[model samples]
Structures are given as C-alpha cells and as structure tokens.
Target: TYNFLKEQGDNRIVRTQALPATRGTVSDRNGAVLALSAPTELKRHYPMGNLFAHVIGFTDIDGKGQEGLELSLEDSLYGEDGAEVVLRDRQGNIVDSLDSPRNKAPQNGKDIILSLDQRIQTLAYEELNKAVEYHQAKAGTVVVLDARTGEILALANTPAYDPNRPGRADSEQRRNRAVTDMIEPGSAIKPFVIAKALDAGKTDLNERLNTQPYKIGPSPVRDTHVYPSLDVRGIMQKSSNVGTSKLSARFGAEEMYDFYHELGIGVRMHSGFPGETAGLLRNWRRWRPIEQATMSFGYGLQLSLLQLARAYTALTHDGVLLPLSFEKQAVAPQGKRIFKESTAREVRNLMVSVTEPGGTGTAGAVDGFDVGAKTGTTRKLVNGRYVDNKHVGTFIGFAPAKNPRVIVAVTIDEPTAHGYYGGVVAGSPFKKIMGGSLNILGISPTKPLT
Candidate 1:
C-alpha cells in the first residue's frame, strides 16, 4: 500500500468536507421556528423535529435543498453568499472598510408560508404515528388538503427522520412515502368511475346491480365480499367492484379516460420536485376488456397520493376544481366546472353512506364528527405480477360533512395487523387525525346524522 510520490498517488482520490453553514430558518404560519441553523457547520436542526420531517423535506451535506419544500421551492428558499476582504495601512492607521465596496449583504430569502396549519399537522402526525406503531405497519403517510382551496393543511409520514439526527434512525424512516412512493389505489378510485357514470346520466343513485361475482368480457369481476343485490349507493357502501365496473362499462373507453384525465391521475403535479413521477395512465385505445375491468377497482392505473387528493376536489367543491399551491393564500383560487353541481352532491352523499355502521368504511367513523371516507387495499406488484399477501391499505375522506373543511388521505404499507382492510387499518387513523384536526381548528362538530 505504498506506491507514492510527492502528492502523486491515485489522482481519483478527492478530499471532501462539509460545507460552511449558510443562513436559513423554517418557521410556521405564526413565525414559530420549526428548524434553524446550528452553531457549527451543520445548519439543519429540526424544532417540531421529526413530526414534520416529510413536509419540510431535507438538505444534503453541501447545504443544498434535497427534498420536500427544499426541492419544491429551492430557488426561493436558498440565498446567495457574498464575500469581502479587509485592507490596512503599514503604519496601522485607519483602513478603508472593504465590506461596503467589495461585498453586498446576503439578502434573506423570502419566507415560505405553507398552506398547512401547524396545529393540525402536529395532530395528524401523532395520530398516524400511533396507528403505524399500533398496526406494526412497514411504512405510512397521511395528507390533509383543504377541499375548497386545494391548500394542503397537513402532509405527514411515519418512519420519518429528523434531518439533524438522521443517523439516529434507519434510512427507511426518512423516506417521504406520500410523494416518493407509488402504490396501487384499490377501491379508492371507484368514485372516479362512479362520478363519470353519474355525470353522463348513465346511472342513478338508486340503479340496481347484481352484487354476485360478475364477469367483464372474460375476466370475472369479484366483490371484496359477497352481497346479493345493491343499488349504486349500496354498491359504494359495500365497496363492490362488480357493481362499480358494471356501471363503468355503461360508458365507453373515451368517456372514462377523459374523466380520469380531468381528475388529475396519470398527469404530472408540476410542483418542481426532483424525481416527481407522472403516474401511469395508458391510452384509452390500448385498453383491453380485462384492463378496463380491473381499472374500475384501481388495479391497472397508478397514482401518487397528491394526485389522488387533487382529483377529489371535483367531488367536494360544487363540481369546481382548482390547482394546488404550496404557499399560503389570502383568497381561494377560481376553479373550472368539471361536473354538474347536482352530480357532485350525489357523489358526496354516496360517499357519506359509505361510513355508516354496516358500510365498508364504518371503521373510519368519528364519534362526534360528521366524516365520510373510502377504503382501498390493493395487492402489491411482485415479479411483474400482483401478489395477494402484500397489501397497501388506504383511506380518503373529508370532515364536518355539513361544511367540509379538510380532505385527509392515509395509506399504510404492508400492515401486519388484525385487519388489513383500508376501512380498518387506514380508516381508524383517518378518524383520529380528522377528529384532532377539527378540534384544533376550533370548528365545533355539528350533531351526527342518523
């Protein structure tokens, strides 16, 4: 190990060191510090700590933005560094101040006021963490967006890391599942087809469907659980894929695909993320009968959690949809009418029925809050095929149904628990987060409906 001369060993061996700390601080809507620069060269120190790790994102050793807000708003949050040199006379007399002539002060970057409420974010993170630990989930994420404004109030994840203490935890703990990972959406996508059917006037809330395991072309359309016969309302409440696909088939490929596009899946969020994925949405012309059937239950196409949350805007607002924004807003953005107002209401009503005592989403129910949600459990893709044992459980819902304030989405990856059903594993956490968020916002819950 001694083939050396004066500074002439392996030329490829480059010395590396951590960069000097530049000035930066992460604060809340009220200017409370959530993260800040440290005394040493390491500047990333978390305050609320790991609870909001996924939301704030993190940086590299070079002090550059790596993910989350860091990635999304890098140019705005990072500042330019200035340099200066001093000079003095040989007699030690007064010297010219070089700072003014040679260097300009590094301007503090504009603050990123996030749309999220810190109180609600804390509530969501705690609840989701509890759920993840209780169920022994491999990983999890939760996002709550303002249904009317598309402002994300809370986006939380489990196995999260404190950027200041990344070494204290495993690598997987720091991953942002909400934006970085893609999983099958399961019955959560059923509403998109149901909304299409309703908007096209091809199906009614009371329309009857044979709940028996039906067949689509050659592929058999199976229900998660058997039921005799159910109406459109009952179909959603029971999470019936047979009924959903039967109704979806009433519309041709063009109609369904158009609606799906309008709903924001398979499209890019365009949020300036480094590795942001434009989820898989194949062309309608390529749809096989089996693909279309499976797509009805969210098996074929894939979407990130943000895309799914953005799409739900059509159902919650009076058929009007708006684009998402990371910065806080003073006024709600104008939205385009994607569906008839009546159709939107019908979808919301059908969604509410899904949370009743005997419904598929019953586990998502909160005691005093008027909440509605849908459960999804899709088999994981393995060896180029979907495997039954591995499941991604998901729950999506909004709260205080009379005047919807928040839309929450929770996903549990490979939950090893009593019930892996989205309604059970994911829904329970959804209820906890929603309840806590509602209470934190000081929005008193109205009386629950019968």
Candidate 2:
C-alpha cells in the first residue's frame, strides 16, 4: 500500500500541503471556514449549510467531490491522497517548527479560501428566496461582483440544495443557474449596445433620434412609447427598442459582434467553477437585417447572469473589463479595455437615469446611493418558440454611480404573482441586494438625501 512506512520520525498528525490526503479548508473570504473534514469517512461537512451549498459545493459519502467548487478544486482539495511531510496552522500557514514524520498522518484537505462574502451571500440568498416566493417564479439567481476588482461577492440561486445529502433534492434545485443557465436577456443588454455605439462615435449621448418604429424586416423594432424624437438618455431611460435598433444600424453586424466579443459575451468565464457555460452568440455574418436589430435588444444572443455582471465591470472599472474571480484578491487583476473612460462614464450616467423617477417608469431607487442600472423583461423561448406566459425579469446595476463600488444582477424566471416587467418585479430585489451589499462593504453613499 502507498501508506506502508519504512521508518518512523516525530510528527504532529498531517496538516495542509505538507501531508498527503490533506483537503484544504474552503473559506468564504470573510471567515476562512466551511467544509470541515471527517477523517473516519472521507465526507466533508459544512456548518454554514445550504445557504452556500451551490458555491462550496459538496463531497459525497465516498469522499468524492461533487459539483460546485469542490468538483472544480478536485486536486486542490484532495491532492495525491497518500503520504507527504509538512505542518501548517489552521489558516494554512506553514510552520517550520514541526518536524516531518516517516509514517503517514491520515490526509487532511488544505484550506481553500474563496472571495465570497458570507454577509452578502446570505443577503443575496434570503433576498432571492423572498423574490422567488413573492413573484411565484419558477426559480431565480442573484450574483454580486466587486465593482473594482471583479471579486465574486455573493452568488445565490433557488430553489436550493444542501451538499450534506445530495440525494435528497431534485436536479433543478441543485443547479447553479447563475453560471449554468443561458437565455435571452432582452433590455438587460441594451446598455452595452448603446455604450458601444457611443464609444465608436456612431451616436452622440445628446443627439436626438427619430423614434418611430424602425422596420428592418416585416417585424419592425418598436418601443413602449412612440416618441417623435428622443435623446440617447431618453431612449435608455425609456428602454426604447426602436431607438436602440436605429442607433445599432449605425454600425454593421461585424462591428457590433467584435464589440460584443471584447465585452466577454459568448466567452467562457472559466471562473474556476464546474459546469460553467459560455452562452451562444451566432456569427455576425449569419444574422439577417432584422436579427441584427433584435440582437441589439438581446435576442439572437445569450449569456448567464454572472456573465452580465462581469461585463458591467467595464463601467465600474472605468472602461476596463475585469475577469471574474472566485478566490480572494489582495489587489485587482489586470483587465482588458472595452471602451474609453470618457465613453464608459457617459454610458454609466445614462444608466443612472434608469433608477430615477422619470426613468423606467417603475424606478428602482436605492434611497441614499446613486444607482445606474437597466431592467429587462423578456418572453422565454422554449422548444424553439417564444411563450407568452413564461417570462424572465432581470435587473443589472451598480451603486454610488459617481464612484462605483459593487454591481448586482438579479434574474427571476416566470414571475406569476406580480406583473413581470423587469423594472417592477426584478428591480425591487435589485434595490435591496445592491443597497445591502453596499452597507456590508461599508461604502458611503454618493447621493445622500435629507
């Protein structure tokens, strides 16, 4: 056997990295604890329970990693499962004082620290439960990313499952919809198109446009209201499908597709989680004129809520698109540039208009902070057909817009109890999630009202 020791030396049981079968302790960024190891049976236990089930993932009775990070951190959690020599403290800090022993000291996993904030993860988890229940929606997901470094602050989905016993819950509840599910984003993607056009100088933020129905094909692009002329700010404030389509026409499909590619759409986030999917974005050459117009408003393209939040980092990071991170970062990683800083702020200010009294009609105000966001309500397409009753309501935005700190995105599927406009249904929860996350981060409000 691999454990047959030829000699004996002084040792203090096996600890992280230095010893074999050492599974790391997975921290939730804040506490540095979760998933304790039970030596007798390889099963890892989680004291925090289901609230973070989908993130920490789980280990079955056989001591095998399940989905979530456990599966992704496979070797990191359980390396050789044999013999090694070293000693480390609870925080995984190696200690030089302990001597390595010739005999094996039963393997223990090392501490795997995460970037997730327990306070915010719980905030997102409870809010999603409330939103899904109040809306009577089939399911939902809420993802939070640090506005500056793109650190994953919180990720919540419902219905949920506990890793303690994976067999108890059905498949759907166990799924991490934030990174797994892909769907039409509707107006949720409008700002990107607008921001792209603004960056390319194809459209001016203050320039007024003809807001009549734009007919690229038989199905003309229309809006909630028929404005004779509306500026870019007004268009975003109203989510004018016609205005967005009209401006999108300024640039060809190739230009827009290249722009989209730069923003991380249709690209795998590779955020170190298992079962993460890169949503579909068909080649621009394949799109017909009308399809291009629809794509401008989030059709003929798809992405997960986590992707959307990651993309918004451009606005918060002053035009740089930071890659999403699951592990804690002492400093922000280098990100690619999506647009110029000037254009990013211009577009950001336009989104800020969305949560105002006159914007979106059903504005989602966060009381003290200045919020820049866009809400989307899209009909779900099932089996190649768009269904009327089934809808997805979503809101993507950040707080303290002047100097952004956190970005939160919410998606509620098929909300039945209340009306299904993203601004109305999804927006309510976005406020709480965004506002609460700000408090947890100790972020001061940019716009404090008396």
Candidate 1 structure quality by residue, lDDT tens digits, 1-450: 222212322332212222232546667655677766665544667777777787777877766777777766667666665444433334433233333454555554456667777887888888888888988888888988888888888888787887776556665776767776666788888887887788888888777877799665576778767888898888878888888888878878877787778777787777544555677778999997778778888887888887788778877887888777666778778877888988878788778888877777888887777666788787777655876668888999887665677889999888887778888898888988887777777877687634
Model 2 over residues 169-209: C-alpha lDDT tens digits? 88897998999988788887888888888888888866998
Q: What is the lDDT of residue 355 in candidate 2?
A: 82
Against the reference, the lDDT scores of all candidates come to 0.75, 0.82
Q: Which candidate has the top score in lDDT?
A: 2
When summed lDDT is taken over every stretch of 10 residues in candidate 1, the lowest stretch is 12-21
Clashes of each: 1, 13
